[PDB]
Amino acid sequence: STGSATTTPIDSLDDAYITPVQIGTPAQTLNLDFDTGSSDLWVFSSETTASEVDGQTIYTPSKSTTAKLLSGATWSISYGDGSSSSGDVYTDTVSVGGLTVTGQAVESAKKVSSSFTEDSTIDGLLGLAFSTLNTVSPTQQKTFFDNAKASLDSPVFTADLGYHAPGTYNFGFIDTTAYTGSITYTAVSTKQGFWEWTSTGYAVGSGTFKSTSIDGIADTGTTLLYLPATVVSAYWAQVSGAKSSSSVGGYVFPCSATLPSFTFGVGSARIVIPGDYIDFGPISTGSSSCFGGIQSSAGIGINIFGDVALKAAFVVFNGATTPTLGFASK
Numbered sequence: 001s002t003g004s005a006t007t008t009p010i011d012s013l014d015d016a017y018i019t020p021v022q023i024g025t026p027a028q029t030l031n032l033d034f035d036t037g038s039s040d041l042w043v044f045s046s047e048t049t050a051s052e053v054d055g056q057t058i059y060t061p062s063k064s065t066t067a068k069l070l071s072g073a074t075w076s077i078s079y080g081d082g083s084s085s086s087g088d089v090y091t092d093t094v095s096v097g098g099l100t101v102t103g104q105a106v107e108s109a110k111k112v113s114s115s116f117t118e119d120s121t122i123d124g125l126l127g128l129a130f131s132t133l134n135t136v137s138p139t140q141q142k143t144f145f146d147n148a149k150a151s152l153d154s155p156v157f158t159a160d161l162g163y164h165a166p167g168t169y170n171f172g173f174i175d176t177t178a179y180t181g182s183i184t185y186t187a188v189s190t191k192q193g194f195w196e197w198t199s200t201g202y203a204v205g206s207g208t209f210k211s212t213s214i215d216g217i218a219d220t221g222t223t224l225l226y227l228p229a230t231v232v233s234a235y236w237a238q239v240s241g242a243k244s245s246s247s248v249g250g251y252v253f254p255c256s257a258t259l260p261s262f263t264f265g266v267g268s269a270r271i272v273i274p275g276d277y278i279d280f281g282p283i284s285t286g287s288s289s290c291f292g293g294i295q296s297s298a299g300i301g302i303n304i305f306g307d308v309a310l311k312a313a314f315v316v317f318n319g320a321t322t323p324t325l326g327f328a329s330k
């Protein structure tokens with residue numbers, strides 16, 4: 001089997017991407033944040049505290065004839081960006097663009113933190129990291145990709161995120177018309193439960209490529225590109241007037257600047273992030289100071305190839321017995 005679904009930026013800054021997902025019988029369609037950095041499928045629901053719902057589409061398990069409460073199972077997640085959610089668990093049928101999984105764990109939110117409430121465009125998350133990170137207790141549950149994997153034509157899914165434009169998540173096949181050149185594959189460590197790999201280095205604009213190992217994760221759920229302080233300083237030094245602002249919490253730059261590109265290495269291959277992918281607009285409405293899309297990972301403790309980097313590539317998440325990661329230009 002295969003599946004294919006369009007993914008859409010939630011706003012003009014590509015802060016996140018939503019993909020429609022069918023849950024239950026009859027189908028309840030929710031727009032979920034496909035997240036290769038976490039491993040829980042959780043949704044706003046009829047059980048979510050009313051004051052914490054503000055525009056989201058909710059899943060109502062009592063109206064799904066295939067929904068079954070998973071007795072005694074709860075979940076609770078604390079994300080690296082400080083957000084959180086928790087609730088109970090149902091099993092139900094879940095479909096993504098023609099691909100169907102029965103008995104998927106659908107984690108129903110009773111509580112969500114303010115950042116989720118304030119974002120009316122995201123109805124929940126669909127985790128695509130490794131199932132060892134799933135938070136359901138006392139019995140851990142499997143991700144949608146894990147449940148579907150054996151039935152797929154190939155045990156793979158691909159992320160093709162657009163810059164200010166629609167994109168595609170494919171399951172079970174590689175669309176060879178969706179990229180240029182060849183796909184370069186690179187080793188993955190699953191020891192932290194992430195799609196964790198080692199970049200071979202970087203370049204700023206037309207500058208010389210710096211060969212240096214950068215261990216990080218491919219995370220569609222993170223907006224920005226988080227890299228070591230030495231690398232991020234080298235990038236923003238090429239933007240006149242850019243500086244790290246302690247009050248804003250990162251590098252900012254004059255909105256009138258033309259940003260240089262940023263290149264990262266995948267083996268001997270090179271992925272080029274155009275300069276305007278790194279512009280995240282005024283720090284506050286009406287300001288002429290703009291927020292940078294490349295930031296230091298020093299506070300986070302891990303390097304994150306988030307949407308800023310991944311949307312410059314066609315990205316293969318290869319879930320074979322030994323998983324690997326593939327990158328192509330597009």
Ligand SMILES: O[C@@H]1CNC[C@H]1n1cc(COc2cncc(Br)c2)nn1
Pocket residue numbers: 033035037038079080081082083125221222223224300304
């Ligand atoms: O789908 C998850 C919940 N919200 C977005 C995703 N997520 C990613 C992380 C990783 O850590 C950080 C990422 N970006 C900024 C900071 Br400050 C920390 N935590 N949450």
